[PDB]
Every structure is written in structure tokens, then in C-alpha cells.
Scaffold this active site. Structure first.
Site, short mmCIF file in Angstrom:
data_model
loop_
_atom_site.label_atom_id
_atom_site.label_comp_id
_atom_site.label_asym_id
_atom_site.label_seq_id
_atom_site.Cartn_x
_atom_site.Cartn_y
_atom_site.Cartn_z
N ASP A 1 -9.52 -3.83 5.93
CA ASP A 1 -9.58 -4.76 4.51
C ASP A 1 -11.13 -5.52 5.62
OD1 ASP A 1 -8.38 -5.04 1.89
OD2 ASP A 1 -6.42 -4.69 3.28
N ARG B 1 5.72 -5.81 3.78
CA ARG B 1 4.55 -6.51 3.66
C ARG B 1 4.92 -6.59 2.11
NH1 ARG B 1 -1.82 -4.64 5.03
NH2 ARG B 1 -0.46 -3.06 3.91
N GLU C 1 -7.95 -11.21 6.43
CA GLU C 1 -8.99 -9.90 6.38
C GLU C 1 -9.92 -9.95 4.90
OE1 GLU C 1 -5.01 -8.25 3.80
OE2 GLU C 1 -5.94 -7.01 4.58
N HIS D 1 0.85 -1.23 -0.41
CA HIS D 1 -0.01 0.52 -0.21
C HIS D 1 0.84 1.19 0.13
CE1 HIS D 1 -4.35 -1.31 0.07
NE2 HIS D 1 -4.22 -2.77 0.44
N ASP E 1 16.38 -12.61 -0.74
CA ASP E 1 17.11 -12.57 -1.26
C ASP E 1 18.02 -11.24 -0.59
OD1 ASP E 1 18.74 -14.99 -1.82
OD2 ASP E 1 17.07 -15.00 -3.85
#
Ligand SMILES: O=C(O)C(=O)C[C@@H](O)[C@H](O)CO
Ligand SMILES: O=C(O)C(=O)C[C@@H](O)[C@H](O)CO
Ligand SMILES: O=C(O)C(=O)C[C@@H](O)[C@H](O)CO
Ligand SMILES: O=C(O)C(=O)C[C@@H](O)[C@H](O)CO
Ligand SMILES: O=C(O)C(=O)C[C@@H](O)[C@H](O)CO
Ligand SMILES: O=C(O)C(=O)C[C@@H](O)[C@H](O)CO
Ligand SMILES: [Ca+2]
Ligand SMILES: [Ca+2]
Ligand SMILES: [Mg+2]
Ligand SMILES: [Mg+2]
Ligand SMILES: [Mg+2]
Ligand SMILES: [Mg+2]
Ligand SMILES: [Mg+2]
Ligand SMILES: [Mg+2]
Lengths: 253, 253, 253, 253, 253, 253
Positions: free
Chosen positions: B177, B72, B151, B47, B86
Site C-alpha cells: 500500500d 487483520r 500505509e 485481502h 469475541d
């Protein structure tokens, strides 16, 4: 297209303009600040990690919003002033101005020949919108605003001389550099410093120039606004971010 | 060099970790947040306008500071999870997890073969410090922490099944959400939504997993901490920046 | 202008090409590699922090030099293959190819309709030099080279089927993923793994395809070249940088 | 602040909107295009080297100017659509839409739950101006415009079905992909292709949807405008730059 | 938070510090160097393509690791020294210092008024961690280290005067510029040049200052360490990367 | 590897070189210009928003193409000249040169000691390809080309003296700055200005130096080529981009 009207410059004579210091050095952060409704946003090229390209990105963000942009270059460097005017900064705040001779050179730095020494490159410049502003080379000088900072003993020693320079629109007082110059580094709140600031503001306004200052202290800021100070910055984005995050954590430690 | 210890993962069993959402999408802003003293910082790739390279810059900033980084990703995309591991993200928060089958796939996405499907590229990775962590391929899986977000109604319809997945360390509830899914878009405060959140947190903890949530509402945040919620984000950098600038301007309008 | 000739692709049938892995994810570092004289440079979009824009900067750097660029995307994602081809990458190495069906889709991803599914956007593309290559849409397909990686048990289980796909120019064996898939993670040097690599190289060449591999082990690399392996990468920029700085410090501790 | 009004969307029913393709992938170039006075600017995330962050920078440049921004993502990818809506793209052009099922999913991708599947993150989003648009989660869906591209035989085979999807505001015809799909790659000017384009435009408008197209051919563009085509792009910034520089050099060779 | 302790500065009096030149001009490459264990890393703003913003990214990378950062600005420019100190560089290496007057100005450039001329901007600076170091303006000067380069005949002509400047912590000899100034460009190994370097090191240490030098020649480096040289850089990242890739290719030609 | 031959410098004595101004300040835009076939490309660091790092990216783009790069720094700043030479700019155009003393300083700024004052940093420089050009420090000075701009009354007042400086290869006349200096800002077309330009070109060529100019006016450009002017820039990328987009929109308004 007509030249962008410099409303900051016009308002120096008609109202008291509330400002925010923008030191997050980022087009995205500059846009967040631009949504708030400050009269002016100071894009700090002296004390934030900015260069011509990051300052351009912040001008572009801010341009969609009524807030007026002011750019502080790292020093009163003529070629850098040329670059910042060409990316379209219409108001400049020059640090550490210390003589009428230096203030006069900064005036010339902002004006095209033959009256000034601003390099001509209108085909290339966001300032002319790449000649989409068709009379730019005739109309430019009128919408440019020059502010200078007095923040050393030498500056105060030359204040009357600087205030007699035609083309200086405003003198900004930086309490951090000035308190340090006066031997009260980190303590601008001291009476010795404050009395000098008040007298300096009174002299600036008495000579018909706009006075400006920054204080994150609400009481000092409202005091400067009661004296008639024309452009008052009331906080700093980096400080507000750090303080808001600290205060929130403290509720949970 | 030994592998970086994931103190966030360990602290899921020993304390309640206070978090700050990092959506300013910038290594310089991330560093400001890193100085404050949050237990965790959520680098939002869903977001906020982040990509692998801007998340890397924020990991590098934050790495000098005690605050633990959680990332996230935009979705539970196996290749993207491979890229974030990584560059050295040791804790991932997967959005919109809706089944045990999807949660199991996220577990595998975080583990090397033959037990998982994480692509092997240790010579190249900041995660291995380019093999300066000499046993990385044997020690990596132990310091990776997988969080999933419930969510949606479908996620709540599969909550018991998700909570039975070995390898899910925590389930985070996203009230934005969730309240929208439940037909209360913009109004997570509603009793219908809050009763579902409380029961969800209880079921998560009853199953031996860590429960997580974000609320910028101090009262709701402290209510969730009273229930024993293990990881609680209490604010968002973009929100704190905008609110602090707005509240300041309002003192001068 | 004629289309850039893909000399890597031609040389798959005429010589053994020595390669360098480029994972420093930077146009400036890519140019340093480009000066050395390698036959090919692998710009790693899978295990180095690269995106379309950083890969473009590295193609632009390398383009002045004889070394041929090969790009590894993060996965066999058709839209991402479209993007890498349009920025002008003429050779692609697709990781984790596991079936004839997936390999055939990768072939199609690299060819224009009506024979393939490559999105058409020649006016916008560095690949066509913005239509300065006037016959680009007629001549593009000939200078594109498709390599696929076999690096899982499933890939080995489908090797004969993948080798029968018209349009796969080469199969590259990745010993890191393959050793991990075989339950020898971090130890590709084991005889069980090496026998499987040798048999795999033999089968690839017997089917008329080019075989490729990476080994930083000089002895393994020369063994693979003695078998006739057509494209052999012999080191990684991150590893060589880290190892050369460590070896230097060790002389002074 | 009220939500930004989507004038492109409103004008789909009231006038014919002239567009420019923006593939220079740069905030500075996007600003140059924004000064010209096009009704719309297509920020190409499919065939120009753009990512979420470069598209954000171009939205910020363009936002100061009346030209409406339209963003083409690389594919109809739900998480990418989520990202582009949150950075504040109010109109999307989805490539390679081939069924009513796919068109319906793209509708949902643009709408908040419970009616759609757009991820909720308004605190973080330029789209809500970080909640400075106070009713954003209530007002958002109304100012979002969904355009889909028909540019394959399968798309034409599903045209009536796509045109019956509530929430598709417009169908754009891409002559490059379509001419290639029809086996006339690089020759969209052919009668076989043109008759299909004209019939397709007539069907689009007959079903009450906006039709759109790109042609750099002035005669074809004015022909499409005489048919009533609602959104016509008439050139491409990369093509105009290359052609203007070539034509100038030719005067001096 | 207490001010970051400048361990480089302390160690000038207690040990011989081994350094690595960092000219790859990149946060990611700087982090790779940071992992090796060098005492100091020279971020070269003079001969590598760095600016304030790229040097900041490299300080942020290096900050998680024990290696001490030293920044070389392009010249002894007071405003540029201000910028590098505010982003948090605690040790500076000033090139081409040629007089006691210039060295004294460099001292002042690094100290706050009233004793120096360093611009005050602690609220904005990573150096103060945005005032999270609460006593920064009282404690800054102690943790700043000033090194100057003598690398011209004029510098050698003023060496005793430069060594008498209170505030110069160290003099670094640059054999490239010095050999060139002496008419042996590209051949610092000549006895005429080496005798001048040895005498220079002896005079520096006899005056109680730290001596420094760079040599990629192991034998010259250990000779300089046997003389007691306090800070010795023993290689350059660009050179080690190029040489290690060339040496590898040579084994395969 | 031998040093890159400066064909621009050689061609000053053998032909008339057609130039394009590059002010789009972007490696991708520079590459588009590089495809066209101009003899030279002027990367503008004075009037476009460029810095060392963005000029480097443009040099890397252009390097694959026959077009010769010329770089204009923001001013005749010795340290900045040092930085542009090290990133590998082989031809410099110095703005606002006003005396033989300044021109001589620019000559020295371009040459290594002991004859000049160019700082030595060959291990680090793209100019030496990080010493892959093994004799760079002996061969560098021969492939450097110095151009100076006369664009003030003071420059014209010192023209004979500037033309007597050994090491100045060419004098470029900037009609924008010159017409402004002469009190015809925005109107270089005036006969008073044009007669001064023609006499200046004649005096430059009479003294054995190359004369240069920019005019976007085709007639003036061809007039200057008829006088034998050696390097003539005939357009500006930003101007061609804006005019081509405006002319296209006008066909549809
Ligand atoms: O307002 C002033 O005093 C300034 O000139 C600059 C500002 O950066 C302060 O120093 C905050 O620390
Ligand atoms: O915490 C939640 O609800 C989230 O999952 C994401 C965050 O972006 C919020 O929606 C802020 O609007
Ligand atoms: O060559 C292989 O095995 C690869 O496919 C990738 C490379 O990154 C290695 O994993 C290095 O660790
Ligand atoms: O308009 C179309 O046909 C498109 O869909 C995209 C555009 O990039 C063209 O392919 C130009 O080459
Ligand atoms: O150590 C020196 O001599 C320097 O001052 C700079 C370094 O860049 C060398 O010149 C490498 O070529
Ligand atoms: O050619 C000249 O006159 C210049 O020196 C610079 C260029 O920027 C023009 O002024 C375009 O406006
Ligand atoms: Ca990116
Ligand atoms: Ca920069
Ligand atoms: Mg100040
Ligand atoms: Mg959510
Ligand atoms: Mg692999
Ligand atoms: Mg298309
Ligand atoms: Mg030197
Ligand atoms: Mg000029």
C-alpha cells in the site's frame, strides 16, 4: 454444446502428461493449482478429506483452465463412481484394483446400459450440463477415461489379466502402497521395489496401455519419463506448501 | 481456566517474532501453516476471502499449536472488531490507520466499558470459553494486543501523533500500500520508498512501540531484522504455494 | 399466500413472552431450540459467529415450529438490516441505540419507500417467498417489529426521546453492557444497576412500549416478569450446554 | 498470463448486452445460469443471501463460460468493494448512488493509489491470479468497469452531476426501488414512472454513458432495447424457477 | 515432531475414563464440549449427521484440549476407516461387530501393510501432519486404538471369539441397540437386559480387554464404574442441550 | 409431541400425488420448491450432488411447508438408509432394486430390531426430535414408507417376487434407467418401452402396491395418471431452471 473433449485421454497416446496431486480439498486451492499449467490435476478423494460436494467445487474451479482433472475415489465403489461421473469427472483413478474381474466391473461402472451399469440421470448432471449437451447419453462413454491402480502383491499377481481388460485405459503404480505391500513401508527408493516398478511399467506399455506413477523425487520422476511413462505426477500440493513454509522459516529459524 | 496468555504481545518487548501470512482462508490450510513453527500467523480478513466464520475455523485449527494468531480485519470497523475479539482473536492488525483520533478509537474498540466501547457478550464468546474463563471480563483487556498499519501519506503525515497513542502496541508498515501511495505501485524496492520505511521503523522504535513489516524478499527481511524490527512476516502461503508448484513444473515444463 | 403473521409483535400487547438466546450459530442447534416451546428465539448476529447466510439457515430450521424468531444484527447498519429483512427476519433487536435520531433511522431502515429507506427486492427475497406472497410490498411493513437496546449511559440519557419514537415497538435492556457502562462490569446484580433497570422498565411501559430483558438468574427473571416486562429471555443455549456438561462431569469428576 | 479482458466493459460501446439476475446464491446454480448464453450474469450481493465467499464460488463456476460476471455489493462500502475486486469481480453495480461526491468515491474505490483508494494485496488475490498475472498492478484499472444505480428521487435530483463523473461507465435504473421512491411501490408499469425511466435513459446515453435496466416484462425489455439501452437484464433466476414450477403444477393442480 | 500420544489407549490399562457423546455435528459445539474436562469425546459418525469433513473440523477444535477424541464411523467400512485414520482420529469405535472374522478385518483396516490393509497416504494426511511427523509410517500403529461394539444377539453369540482377537483393545456395549435386539426396545433398564450387560462386562474384563458403555442414567453409570468398566460415557450433548432448555422453560411455562 | 404423520404414505391409498424432483442440492432452492404446492418433493441423493448433511438442510427447509419429502439414497446401502432415517426422512425411494431378497433387506433396513436391522440412536436423531417425541421407538415404524425402483431387466425379471414383499409400499419406474437397460438409451418414448411401462404399472396396482413414475412429458404424465398411477413426478428443478432461462434468452437471442 458438444460434450467436453477429454484431452487427458487423447494425450495418453500422443505425449507424456505432467501432473500435480491436489489434496488441499478446497475449490480455492484447486484454482491456485489450476493456474500453474500442469497437464493434469489429481483430485484425491481417497487420501484427502474430500466428498462428492468438495470434489464438485474443485471441478468447477479447474474447468476455466486447460489442466485436465482426474478424480481418485476412496475405493472402486460403483455408486460413488456413478456420483463422480454425474458431477462431470471425465477421468477416474480407481485405487487398489487386484483382479481382471474387479477391473471389468470398473469398466462397466463407467459405461451406460446396456453395455455398462452407470446409472442414468442426465437431466440432473453437471456431466450433461443439465441436458445442454443434447446428445450426452450417446457421446458420454467416448470421453470417459478409466485408470486403475496396481499397488498390492495381489494386483501384481494379476497384472497380465488386468492388462488384458478392454476399457482399462491406464494402470497407475502407487509407490507408497506398493513399497508398504512389499515390506519396505516408507522406503520405495529400495532397488527391490524399483526393479518391480520398472518391470511393471514395461509390461503396462508392452500391453498397449498407458503407465502412470507419482514421484516427488525429481530423479525418479525423470527416470520414469525416460522409460516412456505416459502420466507422471511430480508432486503434491500439501507437501509443496509444507516444504516451502519450512524452508523459508529455516532461513530465519 | 485462566485467560489464554498472549505470548505475541509479551514477545514484542523480548524478541523478534517471525511471521507467515495466511490467505488460503481455510481451517485445513491454516493447520498446515500452524505445524511449521512460525512465531505468528496473520489470518488475513482484508485481502483474503475470509469472514468471521472462516476466521473462527482458522483460530480453532491454530489453537492446538504454539504459533500465535493475529487477525487483520477488512477495516477499522468497531462492530467487526467486536466480532473478531469475541471469537477469540487476541491480536488485531488494523489496516489503513491515518490519525491519532482513529488509533484512539481502535484502542477503545478493543477494551470493555467503561474505559472502552467493546460490546459485552461473554456468555456467548469463544474468547471467554463461554465463561469457563470465570474472570474473563476482568482479565480480557490485559491479553489483547492492538497493532495498526501505516500505509498512506496521511498515516506518515500523522506518524508522531499515532505513536503517542497509549494502547497502540505496534505499528506495521505495509510496503505494497505504501509504495503505491508514494507513486511506486508494484516497486517497493525503490530507494525513495526504502529510505521512508527505514526512518519509519526508527521513529516507531524510538517512541517505545513495536515495529512490524512483511517482505517476501529474504535480503529486505534480514535488513529489517538487523534494524531491530520486532515482528517480521517473511512470506505468504498463497505465494509459496504458487511459486513451489511453478518451480516444480519448470523442471519438466 | 398471505404474509407470515408476526405473532411476537401481536403478543407484545397481550402476554409476557419467554425467550431463549440462540448463539450456537447453527441450523441444527437452532432446530433443537425450536422444539422446546419458547415464545421467541433470539438469533444473535452480534455476539455469536453468525452472518446473513448462517442466520438464514436458522430461520429455515425454526420456521416449522411455533417459536417466533428475533434477529439481533451486529449493529444498526442500514444495509445489514435490509439483508436480514429480505431473508425473512420479521423482528429485529438493534444493539447500542443511543438517540431518537438513531432510533428514527432504524424505523426507516425497516419500512419501504416512500415512508422508509428499506431497499426493494421482493422477487429475490425469502421475505416475499419470491413473490409467492403476492401483496408483500403492500403488507410487509405491518408484520415487521422493531426492538432497540438501551445499554449505555448515553442511551439512558436519551431514554425519554427514544420512547417518543413512533415505530419503536420495544426497548430491550441488556444488563451485561449496561452494568459494564455503569462501572460494574460482570456484576449486574448490584443494587445501583438493578434500581436503574427497574426505573427503566417502568418508564418504557409508562410510554406504551414493550420492555424486554435477559437474565439467566431465575429470581431476577421472575422479578422482571412480576413488573410486567413483555419479553423476557431466561437463558442462553451456549451457557446451558456448557453448564449441563460441567454439572454432569462433576458427579463423576 | 495477461489480465482477464473485461468484454462486458468493451461491449458497453459496441452492442446491447442481455443479462440474467443470479440470486440463487450458490456456485452450482450460478453454473446452470452460466451455460445458457447470457451476455452478463448479475451476482446479487444486495438482495440475495450472498457474502464474499459465496460470490467467489459463483465467480469460479461462471469463469469457465463466456457469460460476463457483474457483482452488486449490498452498498457502496469502500472495504467491501476492495474485497469483491480482490476475489476477481471485474464489473461492479453499486446500489443507491445519490450524488457526484458518492459516484467519485466509488470511482476511487475501484482504482489503485495514487489515483484511487483500492487497497493493494495482489499476492493474495484471485484478481491477479496470486501474481500469475505478472503486470496486474499496472493493467488492473483498465479492465475494471464501474456501474452505479439511480433508484431514488435524490439520485434523479443529481443525475446530470453523476453523469459528469469520469470513471462511471454506466448508470443502471432499478424500477423496483425507483417506482417505490416515486410512491408507486410494486407498480413500476405506471406512465408517471415509465416517462421518468425513458427520459433518464435518454439523458444517460446523451452524456456518453451506458444505460442499463432490469425488466422481467418482455414488452418493457424490448421497448428499452429499442431506445438503445446498452445492458438489459430480462429476468431473475429465483423468479424463473418459482414461475416454471408453479406453471407446471397448474397443469395437474 | 513425534506422533500424537494416544492417552485414551494408555489409560485403558491405568484408570476409568469418563466420556461425553458429541452428536451436535459441528466444530464450534465440539470445542464447547472440549472445554468441560471429559477424558474422552465420542464424535458420532453413525447416529449424528457427520461426514469425513465435519469430523475433521471437530478433531481440529478438540485438538487444543486435553479430552481424547474417539470417532464412531457409520459402519465397519474399510475405506471409511482409512479416511478417518488419515484425518487423524487415533481411536475408533466400530458399530455392530458380530464375529471374530469381522473384528480381525477391523484390526487389519487400522494397520499398514504388510501386516494390515490400511491405505498408505502419509504425505496428504493430517495423521502424519503432512510428513511433519517424520517417522509416522513406522510409529502410527502403536498410537491407534480399536474398539468394537457388541450390540446384537449375534455379537453376544460370538463374544468369546471376538474377545480372543489380538488387536481389539476394547468392547463397548450399546444398551440402545442391545435392548432393542433383545426385544426390549426403549427399555434397557429391564433386569433381563441388565443381567446380560453385567455378565458381558465381566467376560470382557476377564479376557484382558477394556469394557465400555454409555448410560445417561447416573445410577447405572456409577454401577458400571463400580464393576471396573474402563470407558464410561455418562451423557450426550444433544440430550443435555434439549433437557436443560426444557427444564428452564418449565420454571416459567 | 407425537411422531410426524407421513401423509405421503397415507395418501398412497386415497389419492394421486403430484411430485417435483429436487436436484439443486441446496436448502435455499429446496425451500423455493416447497412453496409451490407439490404433494411430494424428491430430494435426489443418487443423481444430484447431495450427502447426509445437504439432505438434512433440505428436510429442515421443506418441513415448514405441506409438501412431503421423499429421499432417494445413492443405493440400497443399509448404513446410509440408517443415516437418512435418523435425520428424519420418513419416505425412502431405493434405486436399482432387482430381487425380493434385496427388497426384503430394504424393508428390514427401515425397521427397528427385533423385526428389522435399523440402528437405534433416538437420543441423537432429528427423527425423534432428540426424544422430544417420547414414544418414537414404539411409533417410528408406522410412519416410515418404503418405495423401491424397478429400472433393470433383472428387476422386471423379479417384478412378481418384489410385489409379493410385505413392507414394500410402492414401486417406482425410472424410464431413464429402464429405456437404457432395454437398449433405447435416451428414447423412453418408444412403443417397446412404453408397453413395458404400462404393463408394469398394471401389475404393481394389481398386487395392491402404489405405482410411481417420473415424466417431464405432460402427455405421458397425464396418460400415467389416467392409469391410476399413485405417485407421479411431473418435472425436475434443474431442468425447469435451465429451460426457463434458455426460453427467455431466445426471445432476445
Ligand atoms: O502415489 C501414490 O503412491 C499414491 O497412490 C497416493 C499418494 O497419496 C501417496 O501415498 C503419497 O503419500
Ligand atoms: O504487507 C503488506 O504490504 C500488506 O499490508 C498486505 C499484503 O496483502 C501484501 O500487499 C501482499 O500483496
Ligand atoms: O442480554 C444482554 O446483556 C445482551 O445484550 C447480550 C448477551 O450476549 C449477554 O451479554 C450475555 O453475556
Ligand atoms: O432491478 C431492480 O429494480 C433492482 O435494482 C433489483 C431487483 O432485486 C428487483 O428489485 C427485483 O425485485
Ligand atoms: O450407546 C449406545 O447405545 C449407542 O451405541 C448409540 C447412542 O446413540 C444411543 O443409541 C443413544 O440413543
Ligand atoms: O425418473 C427416473 O428415470 C429416475 O430414476 C431418475 C432421474 O434422475 C432421471 O433419470 C432424470 O434424468
Ligand atoms: Ca459465510
Ligand atoms: Ca459434506
Ligand atoms: Mg495408493
Ligand atoms: Mg496493506
Ligand atoms: Mg448487549
Ligand atoms: Mg434496487
Ligand atoms: Mg448402537
Ligand atoms: Mg433411475
Amino acid at each position: 454444446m458438444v460434450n467436453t473433449v477429454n484431452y487427458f485421454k487423447q494425450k495418453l497416446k500422443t505425449e507424456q502428461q505432467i501432473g500435480m496431486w491436489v489434496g488441499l480439498a478446497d475449490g480455492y486451492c484447486a484454482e491456485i493449482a489450476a493456474n500453474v499449467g500442469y497437464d493434469w490435476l489429481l483430485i484425491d478423494g481417497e487420501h484427502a478429506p474430500n466428498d462428492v460436494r468438495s470434489i464438485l467445487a474443485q471441478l468447477q474451479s479447474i474447468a476455466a483452465y486447460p489442466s485436465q482433472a482426474v478424480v481418485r475415489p476412496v475405493s472402486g465403489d460403483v455408486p460413488l463412481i456413478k456420483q463422480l461421473l454425474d458431477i462431470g469427472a471425465q477421468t477416474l483413478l480407481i485405487p487398489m484394483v487386484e483382479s481382471a474381474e474387479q477391473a471389468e466391473l470398473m469398466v462397466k461402472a463407467t459405461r451406460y446400459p446396456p453395455e455398462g451399469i452407470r446409472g442414468v440421470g442426465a437431466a440432473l448432471a453437471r456431466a450433461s450440463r443439465w441436458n445442454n449437451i443434447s446428445d450426452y447419453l450417446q457421446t458420454a462413454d467416448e470421453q470417459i477415461c478409466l485408470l486403475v491402480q496396481v499397488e498390492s502383491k495381489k494386483g501384481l499377481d494379476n497384472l497380465d489379466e488386468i492388462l488384458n481388460v478392454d476399457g482399462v485405459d491406464g494402470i497407475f503404480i502407487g509407490p507408497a502402497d506398493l513399497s508398504a505391500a512389499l515390506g519396505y513401508r516408507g522406503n520405495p527408493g529400495h532397488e527391490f521395489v524399483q526393479n518391480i516398478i520398472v518391470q511393471t511399467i514395461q509390461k503396462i506399455r508392452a500391453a498397449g496401455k498407458a503407465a502412470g506413477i507419482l514421484s516427488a523425487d525429481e530423479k525418479l520422476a525423470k527416470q520414469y519419463l525416460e522409460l516412456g511413462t505416459e502420466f507422471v505426477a511430480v508432486g503434491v500440493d500439501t507437501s509443496l506448501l509444507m516444504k516451502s513454509m519450512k524452508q523459508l522459516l529455516s532461513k530465519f529459524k
